[PDB]
Design a protein around this ligand. Structure first.
Ligand SMILES: [Mg+2]
Length: 156
RNA sequence: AAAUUGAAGAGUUUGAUCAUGGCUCAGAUUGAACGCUGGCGGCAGGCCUAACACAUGCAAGUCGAACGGUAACAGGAAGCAG
């Protein structure tokens, strides 16, 4: 029912004639726990405002994910520029074995049993982007059946 | 019947950013040592260095059913003296 959680809040600076201008960026992630997950990156002069902006962004532009019984559909890799991510379905009771950002994104998405690792850069925004991309691309057996022109029973 | 149920990151370069890239940390372990402290038990372990030098005691004897035998001991026998 739209569970949301803020991964990282980071202070960034701009320089002007006067001096430095600080502002805050908030990376949040929302999801319905049934497949839908979406991340948002808001910027404002103060943290709460930034978070609100991020939340609105995340709530819009969500994406559907094919989940098989609260777990992944197959082992999937994902990249986004520096962040290359691996995530593998695991037996019921394994829990989310996943990094920071990754854990958040998976949890809001609704995966209950995963084995993840973040290779490459572990920059939260890029890592979240990578995970969402991987989750999105991951197809289900009904999808493969549709593509190949067979029944799901012939493929298994 | 069961005996692979298995994979987490963080700090640190920049006014800020992403990347590269090192350093550091979170875990487990030990024939450990040192500091402070210290009640009991169970089960293990205990010269990693000088294969350096070694006082002293012990760590390989046994068989008389292989053999001459009796140093003893322990006993009887024969000779005896009270
Ligand atoms: Mg030695």
């Amino acid at each position: 029912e739209l569970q949301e959680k803020l991964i990282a809040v980071n202070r960034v600076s701009k320089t002007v004639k006067g001096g430095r201008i600080f502002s805050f960026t908030a990376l949040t992630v929302v999801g319905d726990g049934n497949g839908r997950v979406g991340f948002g990156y808001g910027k404002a002069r103060e943290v709460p405002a930034a978070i609100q902006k991020a939340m609105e962004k995340a709530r819009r532009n969500m994406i559907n994910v094919a989940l098989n019984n609260g777990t992944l559909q197959h082992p999937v890799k994902g990249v986004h520029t520096g962040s290359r991510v691996f995530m593998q379905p695991a037996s019921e009771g394994t829990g989310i074995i996943a990094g920071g950002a990754m854990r958040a994104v998976l949890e809001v998405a609704g995966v209950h049993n995963v084995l993840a690792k973040a290779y490459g850069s572990t920059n939260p925004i890029n890592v979240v982007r990578a995970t969402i991309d991987g989750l999105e691309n991951m197809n289900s057996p009904a999808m493969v059946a549709a593509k190949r022109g067979k029944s799901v029973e012939e493929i298994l």
